[PDB]
Amino acid sequence: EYGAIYSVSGPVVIAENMIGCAMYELVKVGHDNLVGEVIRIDGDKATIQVYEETAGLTVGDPVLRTGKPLSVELGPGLMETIYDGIQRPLKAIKEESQSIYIPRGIDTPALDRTIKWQFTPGKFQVGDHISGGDIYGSVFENSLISSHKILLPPRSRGTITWIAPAGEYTLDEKILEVEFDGKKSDFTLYHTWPVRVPRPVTEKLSADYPLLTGQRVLDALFPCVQGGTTCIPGAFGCGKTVISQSLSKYSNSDAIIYVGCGERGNEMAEVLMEFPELYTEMSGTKEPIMKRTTLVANTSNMPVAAREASIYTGITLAEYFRDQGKNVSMIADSSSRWAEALREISGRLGEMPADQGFPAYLGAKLASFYERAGKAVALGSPDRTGSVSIVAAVSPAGGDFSDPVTTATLGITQVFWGLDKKLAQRKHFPSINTSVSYSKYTNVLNKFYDSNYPEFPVLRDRMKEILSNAEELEQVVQLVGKSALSDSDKITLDVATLIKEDFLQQNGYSTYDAFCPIWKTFDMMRAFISYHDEAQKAVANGANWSKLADSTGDVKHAVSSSKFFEPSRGEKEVHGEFEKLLSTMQERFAESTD
Amino acid sequence: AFIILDEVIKVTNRRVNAIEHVIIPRTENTIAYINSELDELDREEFYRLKK
Amino acid sequence: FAINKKAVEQGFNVKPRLNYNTVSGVNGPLVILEKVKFPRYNEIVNLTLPDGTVRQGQVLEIRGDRAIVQVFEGTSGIDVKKTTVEFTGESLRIPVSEDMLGRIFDGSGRPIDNGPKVFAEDYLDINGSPINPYARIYPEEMISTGVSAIDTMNSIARGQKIPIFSASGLPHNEIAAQICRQAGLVREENFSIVFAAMGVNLETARFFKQDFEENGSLERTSLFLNLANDPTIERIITPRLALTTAEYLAYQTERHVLTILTDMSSYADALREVSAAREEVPGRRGYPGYMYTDLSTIYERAGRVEGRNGSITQIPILTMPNDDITHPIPDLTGYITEGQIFVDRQLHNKGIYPPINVLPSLSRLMKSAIGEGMTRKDHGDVSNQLYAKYAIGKDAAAMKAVVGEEALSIEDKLSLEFLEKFEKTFITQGAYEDRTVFESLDQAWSLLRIYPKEMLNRISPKILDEFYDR
């Protein structure tokens, strides 16, 4: 029934008279009912770790055992919500305590329990056989998440014997009963799940659909595929906010789960104050992104037991939303801080340190957590198909890349988008360093490119070659001088400069350059290559680049004016514009080359 | 002046190339090795105290 | 025959086993029992969690009446009131039968190909007694892998163990697939292939399953998969299961087996993790003090035998942490083994496939396989000449970047030309191109035409006089 306390030391509490405690399980300790996690067992005693401060505990205080490991509530009412590491609703705590601090031991349900949802019964009906993962209804939540499907929790079977008609229901009402060995199961609108146990799925699949962002330099040279993985450096001058905002505003995804696993405070207040001001543009200036994203935030002074268990909370929600047939995309934030918190937990527990101090777990846990991404087919009746994508952000531990975490994550991920402050400080956005970044999903996207836009791979290979040749020429001009080069070399350098100035660089503060669709980029690459090759042709047949640059005139102008055609004018208009531009360019090269 | 300047530039550029290519990396490797050794000793001290 | 009919007659016997509902603690991945009635060291037990889900364990210590059990599939959810153990009175054994070929098993050696159980011919302990050294015979044979850098500068004799050192991101998977697809005795492609991958991502497993299927090799193979998300402790069992299967096949059905171990680094990491759970004295960089013996008891299971015809060859793939040949894992791996092929990062950045440099690679048993009666008599020393010239090219190029291009005698110019061609035409080859040793040696001779006869000293004059002119 209850176990008393026996000894207290730091965050370690040892209870007694407790028989029947799982090795990992949540217990309520003290008269304030703090939470803890069983760690050791020997006879009656059971070492417990208390998340919050342990001061004021007295021998003999009762202890309650919950009977399940650290879990998370899943159901309606997740979107437009802000949580702590262990899913504490911060928007409701401030309304309950009416203060600015978090009371020690305050407990409120993770989901609002007094609100009416409109439930529509599914295709199942009494007498039918049902199994885990099946859909048996729907719920209306927003105008953006228009249908929130209801799922029978996995690991549950039997024959349904009672269902409710469509109506107004709250999260404390039973709406289904399943008979397996007695009509003794009652299912409400929500269900829980352990956070360290991957959510079951029918079958994993391969990733073959690109993750469209809007930035040309990423969708063209270093593409990412839905269900993939990524990591990017985290610093101040560079700025990953330019990535996060665009990804959460224009990606082709149906949900975003931002996760902050330990930050500086002020620089968390400056992101909690921005999301409820970003408007997506579909079917009009649709409601802010908050209708579509749930957010997990952890400042630096939250309980350490929570700052390390955050990325497990976000990924579980991402998998839950995948289980409905959506394309989720989690976004971590400074996983290095999570690694530091893990090291702190282990060191306090006490274990032999591995390379540089981190425990041996790091290499295994990183890969295990990263394995949850990827496309999959959910287990259920209507045969959904979803995917989850992770975009990490490795924070150089002290300003380097030799620490174990960076190497471990760089060998696990598949993409890398390097960012340099040198480019950013001199007005170059997005500040991508196109030499150290790379992408490995290139050869898996052919099944899509050839079906839609066959010429991509050759064009991008040629452009990468052009840039490499430009930098090659650049480490020699300063010593040998520009005059010692041919006209082909100068043509290559000039086209490289044109690309670097009016293709890679994007505005992001207008309507013409804020989100470049796929064809809007394919056509630009086509036009740039059509200019470069026809320019090289004139030198090949006999001419002087001095007489080519001047004679061309508007040729080097129309290409740079291509980016000023707003992509909101309709695809057909821009396609016609580009085709006419190519025709005019080749006609002029037919004239100027006479 | 042409001959003298050629000589001086040649010697200085040669010295710069030598320093860049076969001095800095050697010292960097030495620093990395010593850094590893220090942690190697720290681990043993920690283990003794643990025992 | 009667001898066959008696070895299994002892099978017809029934031996009940106890159930102990008495646990007295849990800590980390360990579980402590009490009142066990004559434990046995290295036994097998069957935990039955209160949820009703079975697990498996293995005793590690036994005092008067306590047994310390480590659980494979984690330890969470266990309770000291409702759990239940059951001592099987035996070590861990695997069911083997020559019908395993063409099937898929997971880390614990149970089918995952939607098929039936193995229906074994006998049970074998995953461990095995060492091989009486007086009953071992060295190879005296050669395998033609079709890779010039592997079949000319080094060599592989069946019955040999050769690692493949490669960094992370390099195409060691492609090299291994090519080798296994494209290996035969130099004048067979009947090498039954057992394959064991531990600590891999889904993409790698899918790729390997794909490659073995389109080459018509899946009907004579056997795969053990232990992906990255599978339980960590089980990664120790997998290589032993694979090697036990290989030993059965080869030394009891007389067929030549070739084994692949996809990632030994994950095995080492799992060893370190399980060790740190206990308090064993650590070696350098934290790895266990006895890792050398543990690796040795895995590698030293290949070779041939006096009274048999089978022969099992190993190609363990190993990943260095930071491209550091002085790391403990490569050091012990190359101390135990006999030679190793090195995959180079630098050559990879120039788009050279296979990105194999030859200076840091070695093959101990090359000097025996090559000679006369199997290849030309020049093979023994053409390799030495190419080695010397490549080493001279390296330091000639290194010198060029310091003093400039003023002190480079004609020797250095020839050396640089040789170094360029030896990489741009000789090492490089396609992903589906065979190269018999004769053709590779002809090309190698073609690259020594640069040097005049008078300074090819490492090579013998007799070979020069008879081949340098043809």
UniProtKB/Swiss-Prot annotation, chain B:
It comes from the Eukaryota. V-ATPase is a heteromultimeric enzyme composed of a peripheral catalytic V1 complex (components A to H) attached to an integral membrane V0 proton pore complex (components: a, c, c', c'', d, e, f and VOA1). Interacts with RAV1 and RAV2 components of the RAVE complex, which are essential for the stability and assembly of V-ATPase. It is found in: Vacuole membrane. Signal peptide: none annotated. The chain holds residues 155 to 205 of 256 of the full protein. This is V-type proton ATPase subunit D. Belongs to the V-ATPase D subunit family. Subunit of the V1 complex of vacuolar(H+)-ATPase (V-ATPase), a multisubunit enzyme composed of a peripheral complex (V1) that hydrolyzes ATP and a membrane integral complex (V0) that translocates protons. V-ATPase is responsible for acidifying and maintaining the pH of intracellular compartments. Present with 8500 molecules/cell in log phase SD medium. The gene is VMA8.
From Swiss-Prot, chain C:
Belongs to the ATPase alpha/beta chains family. Non-catalytic subunit of the V1 complex of vacuolar(H+)-ATPase (V-ATPase), a multisubunit enzyme composed of a peripheral complex (V1) that hydrolyzes ATP and a membrane integral complex (V0) that translocates protons. V-ATPase is responsible for acidifying and maintaining the pH of intracellular compartments. The modification Phosphoserine is found at S129. This is V-type proton ATPase subunit B. It comes from Saccharomyces cerevisiae (strain ATCC 204508 / S288c). It comes from the Eukaryota. Present with 131000 molecules/cell in log phase SD medium. The keyword DNA damage does not apply. ATP binds at R364. The gene is VMA2. SUPFAM superfamilies: P-loop containing nucleoside triphosphate hydrolases (SSF52540). There is a cross-link at K6 (Glycyl lysine isopeptide (Lys-Gly) (interchain with G-Cter in ubiquitin)).
